Design a protein around this ligand. Sequence first.
Ligand SMILES: CN1CCN(Cc2ccc(NCc3ccccc3F)cc2)CC1
Ligand SMILES: CN1CCN(Cc2ccc(NCc3ccccc3F)cc2)CC1
Lengths: 57, 57, 278, 278, 250, 250, 177
Amino acid sequence: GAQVSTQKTGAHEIHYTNINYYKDAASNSANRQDFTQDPSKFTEPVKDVMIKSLPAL
Amino acid sequence: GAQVSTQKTGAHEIHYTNINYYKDAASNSANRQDFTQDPSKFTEPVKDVMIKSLPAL
Amino acid sequence: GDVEEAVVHVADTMRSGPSNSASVPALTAVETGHTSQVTPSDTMQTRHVKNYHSRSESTVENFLGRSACVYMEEYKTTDNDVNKKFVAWPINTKQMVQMRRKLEMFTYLRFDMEVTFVITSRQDPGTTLAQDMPVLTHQIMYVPPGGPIPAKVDDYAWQTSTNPSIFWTEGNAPARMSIPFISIGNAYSNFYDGWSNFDQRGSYGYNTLNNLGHIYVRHVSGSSPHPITSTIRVYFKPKHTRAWVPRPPRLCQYKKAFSVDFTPTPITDTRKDINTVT
Amino acid sequence: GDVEEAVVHVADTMRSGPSNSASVPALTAVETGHTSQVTPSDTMQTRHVKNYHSRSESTVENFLGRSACVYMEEYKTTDNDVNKKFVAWPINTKQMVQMRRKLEMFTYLRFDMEVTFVITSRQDPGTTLAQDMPVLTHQIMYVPPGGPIPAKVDDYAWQTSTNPSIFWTEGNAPARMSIPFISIGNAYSNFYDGWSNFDQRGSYGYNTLNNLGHIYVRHVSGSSPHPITSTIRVYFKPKHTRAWVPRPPRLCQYKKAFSVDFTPTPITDTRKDINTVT
Amino acid sequence: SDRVRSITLGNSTITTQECANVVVGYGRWPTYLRDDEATAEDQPTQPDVATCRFYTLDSIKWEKGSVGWWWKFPEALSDMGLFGQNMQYHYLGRAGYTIHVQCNASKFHQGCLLVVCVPEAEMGGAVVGQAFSATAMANGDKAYEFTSATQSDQTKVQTAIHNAGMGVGVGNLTIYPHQWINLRTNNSATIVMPYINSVPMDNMFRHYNFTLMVIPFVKLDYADTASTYVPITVTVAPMCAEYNGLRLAQ
Amino acid sequence: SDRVRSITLGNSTITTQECANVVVGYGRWPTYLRDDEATAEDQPTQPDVATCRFYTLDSIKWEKGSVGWWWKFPEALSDMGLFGQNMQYHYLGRAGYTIHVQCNASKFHQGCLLVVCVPEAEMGGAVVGQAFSATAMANGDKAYEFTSATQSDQTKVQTAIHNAGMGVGVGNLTIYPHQWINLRTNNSATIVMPYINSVPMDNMFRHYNFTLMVIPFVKLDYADTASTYVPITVTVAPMCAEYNGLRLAQ
Amino acid sequence: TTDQMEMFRIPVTINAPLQQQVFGLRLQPGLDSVFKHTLLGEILNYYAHWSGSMKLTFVFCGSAMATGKFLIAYSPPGANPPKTRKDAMLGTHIIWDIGLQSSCVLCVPWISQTHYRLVQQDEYTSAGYVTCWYQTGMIVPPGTPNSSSIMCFASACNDFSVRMLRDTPFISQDNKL
Ligand SMILES: CN1CCN(Cc2ccc(NCc3ccccc3F)cc2)CC1
Ligand SMILES: CN1CCN(Cc2ccc(NCc3ccccc3F)cc2)CC1
């Protein structure tokens, strides 16, 4: 029951193993490998979609 | 001889490995993952089954 | 072969609408000794609700699966009184109130045990304290019933050949061990309504079935120029627990370590009147 | 079975040439509350550039994933005042300014916690310091709300049977533990614009929702001939974090541990004039 | 044209011939509580139409010396139609809101207003270490005035405009859902605020879900005209409102 | 047993262990207004649960000399919970009702009561050619007393019990939906009254849809007991209620 | 209460004011003196959080010839507890008729803003009140006692739960036994 995943490196120029020892999910290590994001929530809160090229109004 | 089982988490939003090192079962860790229960023993100790909808007597 | 692999939420509410019929779930009869199984859906209109709550933390395994102190005692490395340089405790779970009450909610128990020992030392006050002493070492010995009992710190009995023992040095982690189910019967009994002699005489109560043995502790060979006092605390942690025949929790304060004696106590506190709600 | 296997760079610039058309990306209207999405490619000729920069270090998980001190206190092994030989701290994250400001950038939080304890000791100054004392031991006890509270160092409450506790000996690594999400609500709330009583009276602010309990610490049995002072530092490290509803960072200095009270502050610093650039 | 908007709730309608786009909270539209997220067991009550309608919350006067105003909800609608009655008779409540602010002036007037909804707008007292009653921050639909100078009276909130009474920079309030009323090209701002709280439902008499704030960032100015002030009106319409736990009236 | 009945409306429940069958109006169960029969155009409001629940309308005392009582609806519930508020704020209303009357006594008491709902129960003044106000016939939930002798006061209705204040024989009231409470074998009477009127909806403050009447046909009697009177309680629950035409509160 | 056993009996009388309150209490199963030492309160005191509905069962222990009706109502949290029957009847309630079936069950629904409540309840996490009132009054024939008693039973429904184990405050000691 071992997980193998890639580690942070560089663009031009790499595996580590992890095993859980405790029965409580709160004991796991931080899951700091997620990088998903979406700023449209705060930057485009309007109802009607506005095209950048077209005039605002 | 490794056991893999799920760990406690949450409803909407997870494996750990265990191995025994000693020859005596008393040395194992607590088996606190069982959640079976039946209260009818203490709440319905009557001989004749009573339907909740029907009158008691 | 290299690996072999191996949750029950509370009941959900269900939509209930207006009703008008001869069925009367609300009415029952407690004389039968039967607790009604009605639910809020049976007396009022309710919406559909999904419950993800679980009763995991209420299991007996988890309820009793916490280490608790059961005995503490002090012994000195050097002193005039021989009896004051070592400890001799008959094993019993009735010494400390909290765990006693926790255990006394069930009539019969069957569990494995995990024992942990915490030892600390301190220099006794005096007119002259300047001294240098290496680290101390302690010995814990378990004597099943009927075995030889040491009478002094340097007795021959301390050379255990069959009696299990632990040697521990200060500064390291607390000592620990496991103990299986060691009762002659099929389960431990917290209560025993009976006598010792067949003629209904002699000892009465749970004192009759307590034959678990003794525990002894001493400083291995430390003997300082000045007195040093040490204290040991014993912690019990049931494992793999099973229980039978629940009992009502105790209401009156404990007064004896080997008896149920008590003093009458009021049922509960009082208020101004039956209507006061503030 | 024996093994089961389980990155988003910033947007790249794109070649842009001369343009002459009716489209006007530069012109917009901020009245809509919409932030313009223009890029340098839309106002000037640009070359093709591949960006390998990543925003990994700006994630909330990493931003809050650093242990920070939240409380420090001192207690003595021996003294005349009983209250001065142990600590009793109501848990709250508003005591230290830096982590308080870090947390206060979000309205609601939901995370697991990792707690680490750092303990150090020192001998108090005096006219006579010559003494020999073995290593000390410390006990940390956590009391959920409503539980019994010890009133002295040697109180009966220190025999925890259900309250979790840690025993630690000096010279070893700092103690550590994990704590799950233990809020009655669906998420922690840094702010609460409301009252306690339904008549809009009583306590006001985030003080109303602080019911996390207490923490107690003491020397297990150490009692030196001369006073010894110890200090404990508590560090919190959120894990598995989620946040909602960002807020503007605080501008004014903090003044109360359980209130938002402040003093008016200038928006920013000043300069000679609107044209000064040196 | 995109400068014409019409909104119809219940038996009331709002028409604007000069407006910008409509801002929708955090991109989330108001909606009813789902079955798998609720906690109360009894059936809720959804008095749609009776409660989901526009309610003009009084009107203020914009002078050359105005500094700003704020209102707190849902307390502002505590005594407005059947909404107030249902609020009084029920233990729990839950509803989104649609806020429309009107402010019109000629093409010779100049000024800019910031309209923003601040959720969990906790405020500090004028004197540090001194409590205030629930009358210096909310007394029904009446608007409260911000102050240019530092507040001195210990019985009211710190009204220093530059700190927004929350000890933060006034210029950073843009983070919250907001819109600007620029007299050059706008006469109204519309914001659709969904229900935001750490619990599925909450008592609506004990907790202020959010605070509305209108701050003139460019002071009003005009010359040689008979119009001495520009009235400003606010209108609010609860949406997808549902109550729970009926009891005696507060 | 058929002598046990249970009724559940909203968040209230009624249980009777000693009762007769349930009478359903004219065989018609209450229901909502259909699309092809309505006349108003705007959307109605159906505050189900909030308004569809039992409401104990006070309690009277049955003596050896009692003659009878009457209540008028929906005026009797004019100030009872959210029902009263919604009645006040809406122009039109429409709802059926479930009436439950409770009266219990030992197996040594004797007496008989007639419970009847009289639709369009128009009443004549005590003095022919003399008007009365709307206070001698309805003043909220309070019960009005019938009189054995002929009424003489010109300011109130003719209370002659034998004529039922409608100039008709009291014994012929059986025609209307009704039930009997005989202390020998009954303790409660239940009547489900549907909405009966010449129009789909009507103002509920101007028109008395129907009148409830409780008349002792066999006077109460007992001997050698410490119980001096038999209290009588009435409980009413609107059903399938829907309002229309919201306006300022009356 | 000079007699401790008297605490378990709720008095009732034949001739009572038309409307009269029988009893009233706060719904704090783990803190109120009424529920503190019951079989349910004792379990709760070992925990910090609780949730779910509750059952209150009432049994009439009068004569066989006696009869009456009672109104039992549960009022969710509010600024003021009910003072009269008209106030009480607005909340959740059940009309109880005394007959061959001697027991009636009032199911207290779980109405709360939070998934859980504190055992050491405060103003923030109040739970409401429970009260009982005369519906019709108690009537008795000749040759019977003029007074009666009622008893109440408390228990948890099938959706009840507890969490965060803690040490109970009811038991304490000063010296080793
Ligand atoms: C009255 N209760 C009955 C149950 N009994 C459980 C029990 C059984 C054995 C032990 N052994 C502790 C021990 C460990 C290591 C060396 C010597 C020892 F005695 C503890 C508890 C407790 C008493
Ligand atoms: C105001 N903030 C809200 C969030 N809360 C997070 C939190 C929750 C629990 C703990 N527990 C610390 C702990 C560990 C071990 C024993 C006892 C304890 F209290 C810490 C932080 C912080 C406050």
